[PDB]
Scaffold this motif. Sequence first.
Motif, short mmCIF file in Angstrom:
data_model
loop_
_atom_site.label_atom_id
_atom_site.label_comp_id
_atom_site.label_asym_id
_atom_site.label_seq_id
_atom_site.Cartn_x
_atom_site.Cartn_y
_atom_site.Cartn_z
N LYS A 13 -23.44 -9.67 -10.98
CA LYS A 13 -24.02 -8.62 -10.38
C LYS A 13 -23.44 -7.88 -9.13
CE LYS A 13 -28.14 -9.82 -13.34
NZ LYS A 13 -29.72 -9.99 -13.14
N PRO A 14 -22.12 -7.79 -9.18
CA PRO A 14 -21.63 -7.16 -7.88
C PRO A 14 -22.04 -5.83 -7.71
CG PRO A 14 -20.08 -7.42 -9.46
CD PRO A 14 -21.11 -8.15 -9.96
N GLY A 15 -21.96 -5.34 -6.30
CA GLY A 15 -22.13 -3.98 -6.33
C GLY A 15 -20.97 -3.40 -6.53
N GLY A 16 -21.24 -2.01 -7.09
CA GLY A 16 -19.96 -1.36 -7.53
C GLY A 16 -19.12 -0.99 -6.19
N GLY A 17 -17.98 -0.82 -6.31
CA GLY A 17 -16.76 -0.68 -5.20
C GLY A 17 -16.04 0.47 -5.67
N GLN A 18 -15.12 0.87 -4.57
CA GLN A 18 -14.27 1.96 -4.85
C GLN A 18 -12.65 1.50 -4.23
OE1 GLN A 18 -16.11 4.13 -1.81
NE2 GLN A 18 -16.81 5.83 -3.07
N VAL A 19 -11.94 2.05 -5.21
CA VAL A 19 -10.37 1.95 -4.87
C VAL A 19 -9.73 3.11 -4.84
CG1 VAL A 19 -8.26 0.89 -5.72
CG2 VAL A 19 -10.72 -0.34 -5.98
N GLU A 20 -9.21 3.54 -3.56
CA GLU A 20 -8.44 4.53 -3.65
C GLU A 20 -7.22 4.68 -3.35
OE1 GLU A 20 -10.42 7.35 -1.26
OE2 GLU A 20 -9.17 9.32 -1.48
N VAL A 21 -6.09 5.06 -4.01
CA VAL A 21 -4.80 4.75 -3.80
C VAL A 21 -4.04 6.40 -3.66
CG1 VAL A 21 -2.57 3.78 -4.42
CG2 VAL A 21 -4.68 2.56 -4.71
N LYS A 22 -3.22 6.48 -2.64
CA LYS A 22 -2.61 7.77 -2.59
C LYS A 22 -1.04 7.42 -2.27
CE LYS A 22 -6.52 10.03 -0.47
NZ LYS A 22 -7.19 10.87 0.65
N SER A 23 -0.34 8.18 -3.04
CA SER A 23 1.31 7.78 -3.06
C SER A 23 1.87 9.24 -3.40
CB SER A 23 1.56 6.63 -3.58
OG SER A 23 1.41 6.89 -5.00
N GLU A 24 3.22 9.38 -3.26
CA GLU A 24 3.89 10.71 -3.80
C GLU A 24 4.90 10.06 -4.91
OE1 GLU A 24 5.67 12.03 -0.48
OE2 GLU A 24 4.26 12.70 0.49
N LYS A 25 5.69 9.29 -4.48
CA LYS A 25 7.06 8.85 -5.61
C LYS A 25 6.61 7.44 -6.07
CE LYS A 25 8.45 13.07 -4.10
NZ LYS A 25 7.91 14.26 -3.23
N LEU A 26 6.81 7.30 -7.19
CA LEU A 26 6.95 6.08 -7.78
C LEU A 26 8.26 5.70 -8.57
CD1 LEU A 26 3.59 6.89 -7.64
CD2 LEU A 26 3.37 4.96 -9.25
N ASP A 27 9.19 5.06 -8.17
CA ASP A 27 10.42 4.51 -8.80
C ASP A 27 10.32 3.23 -9.38
OD1 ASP A 27 12.92 4.65 -9.79
OD2 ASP A 27 14.10 5.13 -7.87
N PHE A 28 10.17 2.94 -10.21
CA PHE A 28 10.24 1.70 -10.93
C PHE A 28 11.22 1.40 -12.14
CE2 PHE A 28 5.92 0.11 -9.21
CZ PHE A 28 5.76 1.14 -8.57
N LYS A 29 12.35 0.49 -11.54
CA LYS A 29 13.45 0.10 -12.49
C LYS A 29 13.98 -1.21 -12.50
CE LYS A 29 16.35 3.97 -11.13
NZ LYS A 29 15.33 5.07 -10.41
N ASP A 30 14.21 -1.75 -13.71
CA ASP A 30 14.81 -2.88 -14.18
C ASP A 30 13.87 -4.10 -14.19
OD1 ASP A 30 17.48 -2.23 -15.08
OD2 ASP A 30 17.58 -1.71 -12.93
N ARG A 31 13.23 -4.30 -15.19
CA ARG A 31 12.24 -5.70 -15.10
C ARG A 31 11.33 -5.55 -14.25
NH1 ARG A 31 15.57 -10.95 -15.82
NH2 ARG A 31 13.76 -11.60 -16.68
N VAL A 32 10.29 -4.49 -13.81
CA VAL A 32 9.57 -4.25 -12.80
C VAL A 32 8.35 -4.17 -13.29
CG1 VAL A 32 8.53 -2.54 -11.13
CG2 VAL A 32 11.22 -3.29 -11.37
N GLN A 33 7.23 -5.13 -12.85
CA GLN A 33 6.00 -5.15 -13.57
C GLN A 33 4.67 -4.67 -12.31
OE1 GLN A 33 3.86 -9.02 -13.58
NE2 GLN A 33 3.68 -8.60 -15.86
N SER A 34 3.89 -3.90 -12.59
CA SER A 34 2.98 -3.33 -11.59
C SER A 34 1.52 -3.01 -11.98
CB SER A 34 3.62 -2.44 -10.72
OG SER A 34 3.71 -1.15 -11.31
N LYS A 35 0.74 -3.31 -10.98
CA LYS A 35 -0.56 -2.79 -11.26
C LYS A 35 -1.06 -2.01 -10.04
CE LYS A 35 -5.32 -5.18 -12.13
NZ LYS A 35 -5.88 -6.50 -12.61
N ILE A 36 -1.46 -0.76 -10.29
CA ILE A 36 -1.87 0.14 -8.99
C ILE A 36 -3.02 0.79 -9.41
CG2 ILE A 36 -1.21 2.10 -7.61
CD1 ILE A 36 1.89 1.47 -8.79
N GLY A 37 -3.85 0.71 -8.32
CA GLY A 37 -5.20 1.23 -8.31
C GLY A 37 -6.12 0.60 -9.26
N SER A 38 -6.73 -0.50 -9.01
CA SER A 38 -7.48 -1.28 -10.09
C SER A 38 -8.67 -1.85 -9.47
CB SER A 38 -6.55 -2.22 -10.80
OG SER A 38 -7.24 -3.06 -11.70
N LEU A 39 -9.69 -1.58 -10.18
CA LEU A 39 -10.96 -2.28 -10.35
C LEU A 39 -11.59 -2.86 -11.38
CD1 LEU A 39 -13.67 -2.53 -8.53
CD2 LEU A 39 -13.98 -0.16 -8.89
#
Lengths: 74, 74, 74, 74, 74, 74, 74, 74, 74, 74
Positions: free
Chosen positions: B27-53
């Motif tokens: 029963k954790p308290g609820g939290g917040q995740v805030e992510v700010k970026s502009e350009k996301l360039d993902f190439k060639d066998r790239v794996q990512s998790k951005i902005g996750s709760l």
Amino acid sequence: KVQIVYKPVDLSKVTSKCGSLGNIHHKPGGGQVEVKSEKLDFKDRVQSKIGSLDNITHVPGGGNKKIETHKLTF
Amino acid sequence: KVQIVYKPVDLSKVTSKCGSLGNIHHKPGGGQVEVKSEKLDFKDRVQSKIGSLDNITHVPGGGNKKIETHKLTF
Amino acid sequence: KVQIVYKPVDLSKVTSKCGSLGNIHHKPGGGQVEVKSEKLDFKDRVQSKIGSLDNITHVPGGGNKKIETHKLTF
Amino acid sequence: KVQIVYKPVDLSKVTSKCGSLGNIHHKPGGGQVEVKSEKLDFKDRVQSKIGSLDNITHVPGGGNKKIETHKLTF
Amino acid sequence: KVQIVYKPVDLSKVTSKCGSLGNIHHKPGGGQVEVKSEKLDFKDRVQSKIGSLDNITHVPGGGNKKIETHKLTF
Amino acid sequence: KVQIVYKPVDLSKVTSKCGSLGNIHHKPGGGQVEVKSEKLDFKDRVQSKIGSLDNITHVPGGGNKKIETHKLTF
Amino acid sequence: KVQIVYKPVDLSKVTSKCGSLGNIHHKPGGGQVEVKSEKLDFKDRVQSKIGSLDNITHVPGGGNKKIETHKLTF
Amino acid sequence: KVQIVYKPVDLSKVTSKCGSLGNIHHKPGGGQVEVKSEKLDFKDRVQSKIGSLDNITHVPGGGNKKIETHKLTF
Amino acid sequence: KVQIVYKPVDLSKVTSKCGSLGNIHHKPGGGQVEVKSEKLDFKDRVQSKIGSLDNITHVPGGGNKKIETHKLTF
Amino acid sequence: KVQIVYKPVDLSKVTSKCGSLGNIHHKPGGGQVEVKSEKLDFKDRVQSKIGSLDNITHVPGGGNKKIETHKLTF
């Protein structure tokens, strides 16, 4: 003439017993994660986690592991 | 003349016993995740998790694992 | 003439017994993580975790491990 | 003429017994992590953790480990 | 003519017994970590942890370890 | 207000293993039993065995026994 | 207000192992039993054995026994 | 307000191992038993054995026994 | 307000090991038993054995015994 | 307000090891028992053995015994 015999033998045990498991409380205060960036350039077998908040409760009745690797290169 | 015999033998056990498992409170308290970026360039066998709760409760009656790898290269 | 015999033998045990396991309280105050950057350039087998907050409770009834590696190179 | 015999024998035990395990309290005050940077250039088998806050409670009923490596190079 | 026999024998024990384990309190005051930098250039098998705060409670019922390495080079 | 919770847990075992059981010879000499009276007057739940010569061979592969009684009276 | 919680946990075992059991010879000489009276008057839950010559061979592969009683009276 | 919690934990064992059990010879000489009276008057839960000549051979592979009683009276 | 917590923990063992058990000879000379009276008057929970000649051979592979009693009276 | 906590812990053992047990000879000369009276008057929980000639051979591989009593009276 080359003769290679690979015959490892494994009769091992990884075990556990537990009478009673319980009364586990996971209650962290909520937190905050803030990430600011501009340009994300991810290339060639890149793995990433950005801006992440998580709460994990893991309570197995037993979580024993056996990891085994066998490699023969000729 | 090359003769290779690969015959590993495994009679192992990974086991567990548990009488009683329970009374687990996540029963954790609820939290917040805030992510700010502009350009996301993902190439060639790239794996990512951005902005996750996330909140995970995992309570197996036993979650024993056996991981095994056998590799022969000639 | 080359003769190689690889036959290791393993009859080991990794074990545990526990009568009672419990009354575990994970209640940290919530915290804050703040990350500021501009340019992220990640290349060639790069692994990363940026801007992360987490709470983990891990209470197995037994979590014994056996890790074994066998490698033969010719 | 080369004859190699590799036959190590292992009948060992890594074990534990515990009557009662419990009344464990993990309640740290919440903290803060602040990281400021501009340019992140990560290349070629690079592993990193930046800007991280965490709370881990690990209470196994027994968490005995056996780690074993066998390597034969010819 | 070369004859190599490798047959180490291990019948050892690493063990423990504990009647009762408990009443453990981990309650540190929250702290602060602040890291300021400009340019991060990480190359070729580089491992790093930057800007990190953590609280770990580890209370196994027994956490005995046996680590063993066997290497034969010809 | 009365609340009764009866929830015992039983993961026990009664077991046996026997490689070989045999070459058992029961060869008592014959005997004689003589019982004499004039009158038998039996009343109200009387259980009796009078004048007997029994020969019993009992050889189970295992005669493991488990007797369990659970009684709740309110 | 009365709250009764009855939750005992039993992970016990009663066991045996025997490689070989045998060459058991029961060969008593025959004998004689004589019992004499004029009247038997048995009443109200009488249990009796009168005048007996029994020969018993009992050879179980294991005769492990577990007797368990649970009683809750309110 | 009355709260009773009854939760005993039992992870015990009663065990035996025997390589070989045997060459047991029960060969008593025969004998004689004589019992004489005129009247038997038995009443109200009487248990009796009168005039007996028994020969018993009891050879279990293990006759390990566990007796357990749990009683809660309110 | 009355709170009773009954939670004993038992991880004990009663065990035995025996390589070889045998060549046991029970060969008593036969004897005689004579019992005489005129009247038997038995009442109210009487337990008796009158006039007996028993021969008993008892050779368990282990006859380990564990007796446990738990009583809570309120 | 009354709070009673009963939580004893038992990790004890009663054990034995015996390489070889045997060549036991029970060969008493036969004897005689004579008991005489005119009347037996037994009442209210009487336990008796009258006129007996018993021959007992008891050779367990281990007869280790553990007796445990737990009593809580409120």
